């Protein structure tokens, strides 16, 4: 478990900044810029994957694409925790590609999620994504988002600000 978290944090750390050039706009999958229309994630790419448990419960998890089949238009993905039976066959709408670059706040603030935006964010010390509001976008290249997770254990329904890296904040594809 300790080693898993080390790899996950390193994966957040090593996500490269989109450098680009003066005069240019950020590409799809830089920060908050959505995937292109009809995009298919590639084997080895990190994704949020919506896994339906046997009892029907739905959870977005961190996973890695294994394959995509044109035959069925489904992905196979592997749960990042690599534990037990890690593989899941999933529809495309159950897979959100994670960003492939950090948006640099210093050059491309337009590619960051903004305050009060609803997002799916990886909860600290977990491999799962949950609904959150952006509390602050990063202001330095290395900095996390600050987010407020929905959390029923608080009377007002929200956590205090928690830090989540750019690799692990995506568009909210989940109803309450």
């Amino acid at each position: 478990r300790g080693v898993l978290m080390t790899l996950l944090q390193q994966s957040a750390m090593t996500l490269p900044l989109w450098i680009g050039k003066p005069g240019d706009k950020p590409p799809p999958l830089c920060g908050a810029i959505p995937a292109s229309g009809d995009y298919v994630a590639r084997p080895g790419d990190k994704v949020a994957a919506r896994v339906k448990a046997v009892d029907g419960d739905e959870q977005w998890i961190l996973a890695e694409v294994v394959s995509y089949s044109h035959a069925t238009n489904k992905y196979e993905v592997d749960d990042i925790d690599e534990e037990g039976k890690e593989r899941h066959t999933l529809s495309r709408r159950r897979v959100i590609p994670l960003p492939q670059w950090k948006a640099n706040p210093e050059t491309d603030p337009e590619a960051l999620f903004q305050k009060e935006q609803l997002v799916l964010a990886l909860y600290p010390q977990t491999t799962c994504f949950y609904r959150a509001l952006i509390h602050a976008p990063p202001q330095r290249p290395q900095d996390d988002y600050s987010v407020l997770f929905e959390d029923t254990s608080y009377a007002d329904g929200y956590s205090p600000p928690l830090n989540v890296a750019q690799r692990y904040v995506v568009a909210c594809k989940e109803p309450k």
Binding site: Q59, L62, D79, I80, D81, Q125, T126, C128, Y130
Partner: peptide, 4 residues
């Protein structure tokens, strides 16, 4: 997966 590790949950909250």
């Amino acid at each position: 997966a590790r949950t909250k």
